[PDB]
Amino acid sequence: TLRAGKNIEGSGQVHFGYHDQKWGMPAIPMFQLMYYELPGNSIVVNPCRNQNYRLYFEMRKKLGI
Amino acid sequence: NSALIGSENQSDSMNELNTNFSMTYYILTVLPGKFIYWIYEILHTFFVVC
Amino acid sequence: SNIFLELQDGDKTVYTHTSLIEESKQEQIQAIYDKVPQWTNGGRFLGFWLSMEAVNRVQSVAKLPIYYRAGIVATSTLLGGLVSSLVFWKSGNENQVAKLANGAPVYLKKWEVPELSKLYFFLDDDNNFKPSLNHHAVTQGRQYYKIYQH
Amino acid sequence: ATRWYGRQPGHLLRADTYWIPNLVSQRFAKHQPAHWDGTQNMPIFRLADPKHKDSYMVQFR
Amino acid sequence: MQNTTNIVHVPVHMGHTHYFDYIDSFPKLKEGPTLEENHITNQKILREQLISGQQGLEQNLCLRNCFKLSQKRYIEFCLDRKCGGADFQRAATILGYTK
Amino acid sequence: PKIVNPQLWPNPNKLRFADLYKYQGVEMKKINDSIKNYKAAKFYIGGILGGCLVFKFFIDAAVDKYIFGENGNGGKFLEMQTINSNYDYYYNRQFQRMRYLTEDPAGDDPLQKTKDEHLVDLGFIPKVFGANVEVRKRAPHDKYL
Amino acid sequence: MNPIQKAWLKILEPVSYVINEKMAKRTGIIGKLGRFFAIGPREYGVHPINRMFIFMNRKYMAFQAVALHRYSFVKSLTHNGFHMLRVFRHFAFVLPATVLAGLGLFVYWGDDNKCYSPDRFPYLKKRAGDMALPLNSLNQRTSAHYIEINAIYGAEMMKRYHKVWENIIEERSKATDQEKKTRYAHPSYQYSPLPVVSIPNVLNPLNLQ
Numbered sequence: 001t002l003r004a005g006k007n008i009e010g011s012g013q014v015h016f017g018y019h020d021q022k023w024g025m026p027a028i029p030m031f032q033l034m035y036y037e038l039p040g041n042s043i044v045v046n047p048c049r050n051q052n053y054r055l056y057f058e059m060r061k062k063l064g065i
Numbered sequence: 066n067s068a069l070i071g072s073e074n075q076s077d078s079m080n081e082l083n084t085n086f087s088m089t090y091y092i093l094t095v096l097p098g099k100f101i102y103w104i105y106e107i108l109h110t111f112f113v114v115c
Numbered sequence: 116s117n118i119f120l121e122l123q124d125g126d127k128t129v130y131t132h133t134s135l136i137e138e139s140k141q142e143q144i145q146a147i148y149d150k151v152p153q154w155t156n157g158g159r160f161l162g163f164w165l166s167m168e169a170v171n172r173v174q175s176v177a178k179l180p181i182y183y184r185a186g187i188v189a190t191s192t193l194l195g196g197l198v199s200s201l202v203f204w205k206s207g208n209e210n211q212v213a214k215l216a217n218g219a220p221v222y223l224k225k226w227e228v229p230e231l232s233k234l235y236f237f238l239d240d241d242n243n244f245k246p247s248l249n250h251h252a253v254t255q256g257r258q259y260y261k262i263y264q265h
Numbered sequence: 266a267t268r269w270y271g272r273q274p275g276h277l278l279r280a281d282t283y284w285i286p287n288l289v290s291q292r293f294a295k296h297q298p299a300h301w302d303g304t305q306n307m308p309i310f311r312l313a314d315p316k317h318k319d320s321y322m323v324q325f326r
Numbered sequence: 327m328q329n330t331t332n333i334v335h336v337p338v339h340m341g342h343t344h345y346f347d348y349i350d351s352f353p354k355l356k357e358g359p360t361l362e363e364n365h366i367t368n369q370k371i372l373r374e375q376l377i378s379g380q381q382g383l384e385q386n387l388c389l390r391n392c393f394k395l396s397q398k399r400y401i402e403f404c405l406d407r408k409c410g411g412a413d414f415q416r417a418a419t420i421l422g423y424t425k
Numbered sequence: 426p427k428i429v430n431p432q433l434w435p436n437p438n439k440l441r442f443a444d445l446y447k448y449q450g451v452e453m454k455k456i457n458d459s460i461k462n463y464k465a466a467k468f469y470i471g472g473i474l475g476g477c478l479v480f481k482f483f484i485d486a487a488v489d490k491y492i493f494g495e496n497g498n499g500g501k502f503l504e505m506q507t508i509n510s511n512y513d514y515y516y517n518r519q520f521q522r523m524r525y526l527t528e529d530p531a532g533d534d535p536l537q538k539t540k541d542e543h544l545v546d547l548g549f550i551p552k553v554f555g556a557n558v559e560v561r562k563r564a565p566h567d568k569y570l
Numbered sequence: 571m572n573p574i575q576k577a578w579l580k581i582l583e584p585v586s587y588v589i590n591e592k593m594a595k596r597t598g599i600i601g602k603l604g605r606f607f608a609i610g611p612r613e614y615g616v617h618p619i620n621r622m623f624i625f626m627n628r629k630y631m632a633f634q635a636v637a638l639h640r641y642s643f644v645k646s647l648t649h650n651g652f653h654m655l656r657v658f659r660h661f662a663f664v665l666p667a668t669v670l671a672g673l674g675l676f677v678y679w680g681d682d683n684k685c686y687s688p689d690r691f692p693y694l695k696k697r698a699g700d701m702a703l704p705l706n707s708l709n710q711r712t713s714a715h716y717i718e719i720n721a722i723y724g725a726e727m728m729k730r731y732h733k734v735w736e737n738i739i740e741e742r743s744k745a746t747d748q749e750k751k752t753r754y755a756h757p758s759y760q761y762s763p764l765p766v767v768s769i770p771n772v773l774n775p776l777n778l779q
């Protein structure tokens with residue numbers, strides 16, 4: 001956020017002013033069943049990317065490969 | 066913050082007028098009742114889960 | 116419906132794909148290819164039943180090693196399925212699919228046959244975002260061989 | 266411009282064994298073919314946004 | 327000003343559920359055809375386009391590639407040099423850019 | 426190999442103090458027992474690697490079948506499936522259009538923009554325009570979301 | 571002791587002679603230095619890591635034998651061998667399967683070893699210098715085709731511009747000062763000759779082709 005152009009006074013996420021806070025997940029089963037941390041490995045490239053390989057199969061046949 | 070020692074959370078009801086409409090003698094009347102119900106919730110839980 | 120067809124244009128042997136045929140007829144073709152195993156499995160039963168009835172009731176083959184008796188039933192089993200497949204296709208089906216392919220494009224070589232579900236296309240903004248094969252990386256065209264007639 | 270580009274939601278997989286309701290429900294789900302419509306943004310999974318109806322259990326912090 | 331502040335231009339409905347905050351529905355959301363229906367719908371367009379829309383195609387692509395240039399003087403040069411002496415307004419009507 | 430002894434102190438007699446000289450041997454004796462197992466496993470490990478070398482040629486052909494397919498037009502590699510219902514799909518699309526139409530307030534700093542007080546002194550008097558109150562923001566086609 | 575330590579000794583045979591025979595028995599700091607770096611067998615030379623593996627290998631292997639040594643679920647179905655009523659027979663092959671899967675514990679450790687990582691979000695944060703990125707970064711991308719195709723296109727066209735650039739410079743050298751100042755000039759310009767001066771016509775200041 002600093003590199004993106006937003007200077008930061010203070011530190012942390014315990015916002016003293018008029019902002020919503022997000023405390024850490026309470027380490028008790030009640031909240032551990034409702035919530036779970038975001039796994040970054042589940043954010044993926046859309047498989048529509050693989051449909052661009054259709055161009056390769058067509059060019060190969062056009063060139064007689 | 067009324068239970069904290071040297072609180073710095075001045076924006077969390079520390080500098081505001083905070084009254085209520087509950088019974089007075091809070092620590093003698095209201096606060097024990099909250100602990101009484103607490104003991105019921107946990108005794109009812111132990112007896113059930115056990 | 117992903118089926119490659121081999122059609123006879125007189126002396127030529129041409130090829131096409133069901134995806135190049137209207138969906139109304141793809142169903143009629145798929146329904147035909149779905150009745151083949153029931154004619155194949157049905158014939159294997161007869162070849163297995165008739166063979167078992169002969170190697171046992173006929174006291175000329177029953178007096179033979181079990182290996183010879185088992186080979187006849189095994190040979191008659193799959194052989195009974197192949198015969199059923201021929202009668203199914205040759206009767207009126209091999210000629211029906213050709214009629215269902217009337218109007219479809221054909222090619223001289225199987226390698227030249229495209230699968231419509233595998234072609235690259237884009238949504239043409241200049242045509243109400245309709246899907247188009249003439250994408251901005253296209254150069255010449257498709258240039259199939261001919262339209263099948265039957 | 267940077268904040269705007271960042272709200273365009275990313276793609277988050279539906280597969281989830283961490284939430285016990287999906288751990289059970291997804292055992293009975295049927296994976297059907299997602300036919301390509303000519304785009305590179307088909308949301309065939311859930312979206313990486315806290316307000317998405319299938320991602321609200323995830324903690325974005 | 328609140329950091330988690332957003333201005334939305336289309337209606338949204340939020341879920342009134344405990345411990346969760348999300349958008350559960352969009353007012354007046356119509357479900358279009360399924361992916362399998364649009365697929366079949368597109369296959370019909372690509373099929374006719376494959377059989378009946380490939381003759382005289384090389385010329386139209388040259389016109390389309392010429393009109394993607396930055397300046398008009400280069401478009402005219404592209405048409406006269408690559409498209410066999412085509413006219414600007416006559417080609418724009420073929421491509422559908424004329425009113 | 427022989428080890429150089431500074432001879433600063435006399436070593437204890439092996440006969441009188443034998444336990445002091447034992448640890449070194451039992452340590453090598455352990456390693457030798459391990460080597461007997463390494464050698465005995467030459468055929469088991471080799472048979473696996475030989476199977477990997479043979480399995481390698483079948484995997485090559487399956488990759489081409491998976492990517493190119495039957496007639497070089499594409500195989501199951503181009504297939505993609507989903508568990509989302511039709512409502513879930515059109516909900517996500519409208520969720521994309523909503524985020525395309527989700528802006529933040531106040532925009533950027535006007536002080537980082539060209540001033541009207543400066544254009545005057547530069548030779549151009551700007552013309553003041555009114556607000557366009559008749560335009561409605563809408564989302565583009567799905568392909569651009 | 572092990573073979574690797576014996577290899578050091580053969581290599582350090584002359585070094586052992588200098589430090590032990592000569593230095594170690596001198597007096598002063600030269601002796602303190604030799605007696606400190608004396609060469610021989612290692613005091614406290616045991617390797618705890620190697621010893622740790624041996625312990626966990628033996629402890630985990632005894633667990634494998636218990637989990638893998640089970641009565642068959644198949645043989646208990648006929649009620650004729652050793653098992654008439656086994657109401658939990660369907661749990662017999664759970665631990666064996668669990669132990670066999672343990673062979674992939676390290677082969678599949680972490681996220682990158684369970685998928686093609688370049689298609690996952692964490693890979694991007696690593697290529698940006700372990701820097702946090704917006705979650706939609708995998709989508710806001712320019713075509714890799716354009717970047718590589720345009721790099722070839724630009725260079726292939728520069729080769730054709732170099733040739734045209736030569737014919738223009740050549741044709742302009744045979745042009746009069748009047749033409750090279752009136753051609754491509756603004757209509758409102760009135761040409762006025764300049765004094766003739768000697769200015770060489772060098773194509774490439776550096777002696778290049």
Ligand SMILES: CCCCCCCCCCCCCCCCCC(=O)OC[C@H](COP(=O)([O-])OCC(O)COP(=O)([O-])OC[C@@H](COC(=O)CCCCCCCCCCCCCCCCC)OC(=O)CCCCCCCCCCCCCCCCC)OC(=O)CCCCCCCCCCCCCCCCC
Pocket residue numbers: 087088089090094
């Ligand atoms: C010739 C005659 C001369 C004399 C004549 C005149 C004599 C005097 C006449 C009296 C005149 C009126 C007095 C007015 C002045 C009051 C000044 C004052 O400080 O009062 C403050 C006090 C608090 O009021 P406040 O601060 O103004 O707040 C206003 C609202 O309350 C706020 O509203 P709220 O709802 O928010 O408040 C919540 C409410 C909560 O609701 C309640 O009221 C709680 C009630 C639960 C308990 C009720 C049972 C009490 C009695 C049980 C004993 C039974 C024994 C017999 C059982 C027989 C069974 C059939 O109130 C409280 O929380 C109060 C908490 C503070 C009190 C608790 C702690 C007290 C300590 C007790 C220890 C006693 C040990 C002995 C020590 C003696 C010396 C100090 O006022 C009173 O409580 C009045 C008390 C009246 C007495 C009631 C009967 C008591 C009987 C006790 C019998 C045992 C002793 C036997 C003695 C026998 C003698 C013959």
Ligand SMILES: CCCCCCCCCCCCCCCCCC(=O)OC[C@H](COP(=O)([O-])OCC(O)COP(=O)([O-])OC[C@@H](COC(=O)CCCCCCCCCCCCCCCCC)OC(=O)CCCCCCCCCCCCCCCCC)OC(=O)CCCCCCCCCCCCCCCCC
Pocket residue numbers: 156159160163164167168170171172177181184185186188189192
């Ligand atoms: C890479 C290559 C891969 C190749 C794979 C494909 C090829 C594999 C080949 C597999 C076959 C190899 C074995 C065949 C050679 C056997 C030669 C032989 O010597 O046998 C006679 C031999 C006679 O011994 P013997 O004492 O020395 O004979 C002296 C005298 O002849 C004794 O004098 P006798 O007068 O007492 O005669 C006794 C004789 C009597 O023999 C007979 O009379 C023959 C009667 C057979 C009738 C079977 C048809 C039953 C239905 C008739 C219904 C009609 C009424 C109702 C009609 C309603 C219509 C809706 O005993 C029998 O053999 C009767 C056994 C009955 C077997 C019934 C099995 C029924 C299965 C039904 C499903 C068939 C599915 C076919 C699959 C096709 C599609 C995939 O007995 C045997 O060796 C038994 C062999 C084991 C039986 C094999 C049959 C299958 C058993 C397992 C069940 C599998 C069924 C399929 C289920 C699949 C559905 C999911």
Ligand SMILES: CCCCCCCCCCCCCCCCCC(=O)OC[C@H](COP(=O)([O-])OCC(O)COP(=O)([O-])OC[C@@H](COC(=O)CCCCCCCCCCCCCCCCC)OC(=O)CCCCCCCCCCCCCCCCC)OC(=O)CCCCCCCCCCCCCCCCC
Pocket residue numbers: 641642643644645660662663
């Ligand atoms: C060119 C090649 C040349 C080929 C020819 C060469 C021939 C050489 C032969 C070499 C010998 C091969 C070894 C096997 C034959 C040995 C002969 C023998 O007598 O065995 C006795 C032998 C003696 O027992 P043992 O020595 O004391 O101990 C044996 C084991 O250590 C431990 O024994 P265990 O009995 O304790 O283990 C039991 C385990 C054995 O492991 C398995 O087999 C796994 C089974 C999992 C599948 C179970 C399917 C259940 C029914 C499904 C029905 C639908 C089917 C549709 C399938 C569609 C597929 C997409 O199965 C279980 O886990 C039982 C419980 C499973 C859960 C049950 C849940 C049922 C309810 C589910 C309800 C949900 C659906 C409701 C919907 C209702 C709607 C109507 O027992 C064996 O059977 C050994 C088999 C162990 C595996 C060996 C594999 C070696 C590697 C070979 C390659 C892999 C091939 C296998 C592929 C199988 C398909 C995936």
Ligand SMILES: CCCCCCCCCCCCCCCCCC(=O)OC[C@H](COP(=O)([O-])OCC[N+](C)(C)C)OC(=O)CCCCCCCCCCCCCCCCC
Pocket residue numbers: 647648649
């Ligand atoms: C294409 C799908 C359909 C295929 C055909 C029908 C398949 C039927 C279901 C197959 C299930 C296979 C997977 C489960 C394995 C069985 C598990 C089990 O518990 O079995 C243990 C049983 C043990 O039986 P048991 O009786 O010995 O001991 C069990 C005793 N109790 C019950 C008390 C514990 O062994 C079997 O596998 C028997 C299953 C027989 C099913 C075969 C059907 C065909 C019959 C033979 C052909 C007869 C043709 C006519 C012959 C005429 C004369 C020659």
Ligand SMILES: COC1=C(OC)C(=O)C(C/C=C(\C)CC/C=C(\C)CC/C=C(\C)CC/C=C(\C)CC/C=C(\C)CC/C=C(\C)CC/C=C(/C)CCC=C(C)C)=C(C)C1=O
Pocket residue numbers: 619623626627628630631672673675
């Ligand atoms: C099969 O049955 C099973 C067992 O046996 C019963 C088990 O014990 C177990 C349990 C597993 C264990 C007890 C093992 C535990 C090990 C774990 C957790 C990982 C251990 C990791 C280490 C000790 C760190 C190793 C670090 C390195 C090797 C890097 C430093 C070394 C470098 C860079 C040298 C370069 C190495 C190579 C080029 C590899 C070539 C191999 C060689 C031997 C060359 C050696 C060369 C020289 C010069 C010594 C299982 C799961 C099992 O299934």
